[PDB]
Amino acid sequence: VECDFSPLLSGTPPQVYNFKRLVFTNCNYNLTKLLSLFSVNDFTCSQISPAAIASNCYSSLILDYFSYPLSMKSDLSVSSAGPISQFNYKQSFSNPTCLILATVPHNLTTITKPLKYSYINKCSVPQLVNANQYSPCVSIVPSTVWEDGDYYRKVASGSTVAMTEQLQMGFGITVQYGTDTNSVCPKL
């Protein structure tokens, strides 16, 4: 019972290419509470609405989260015309999704910052990430890029963005609706 969002509140969130995926079945959730624990800067959805995704019953709910600087919002909007959707993280198009950009407030003291934001700028002929999967280069690219420009090959090149005062993160949600299995519901 009650969906277990606790693991997000403790630790250093991974970089975008190492996104952490939490799967929820048979549990009631409260997303509005989770988001109230943050300063929410952006909240867009595909094939569902912010209101609907906090108030619907699903067969499973998937929450991805990672460190992501709010200044790279453009790099998400560009979609497959840029490295993030090409090489790091790209949400399903067969299921409704949302992507949320958030700053962790000073008062929520138990989310730990990494040395910087990092992402894969190239990973190869090119090896693009398929919707909902990890980059083939997840093995060789380090948890954090050391210096903007590193070239790992066993060909994966990393980039960096300086750390902000307060950690900025991204949350990706994918819901799946079933038949006779929609038992991830909002609590009332």
């Epitope: 019972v1 969002f5 624990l37 008062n107 929520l108 003291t109």
Partner: nanobody
Framework: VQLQESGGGSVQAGGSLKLSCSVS????????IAWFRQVPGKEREGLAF????????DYADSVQGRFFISQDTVDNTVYLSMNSLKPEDTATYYC??????????????????????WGKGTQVTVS
Amino acid sequence: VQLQESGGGSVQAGGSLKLSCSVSGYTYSTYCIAWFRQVPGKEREGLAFIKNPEGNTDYADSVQGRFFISQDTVDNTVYLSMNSLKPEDTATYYCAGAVSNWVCGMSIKSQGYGMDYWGKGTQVTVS
């Protein structure tokens, strides 16, 4: 939801004191109940917390194995048996509720940031 502390007062240097927190108004059964304190001029400190899918508890590390958060089986009132009380333990002790249960260990580490319902506090002074 309504929360009220009691049981405080003057404690001997070294003695123990049991505080309570009557809980009304909760409809579901999943939520966080925490215990806090604040000596004046300073910020609220998190102490102990309860989680109600199972009853798991934890305690901030400055009261480890001295303060013991319990909950009544039938009353759903939460207790706080405190032991080895030092003057540094003198504060106004607040009781706090939240709307879900995973919001707990965090607010216990962040002076009640995510807590929703609060009591007026009771006073504990150790000599």
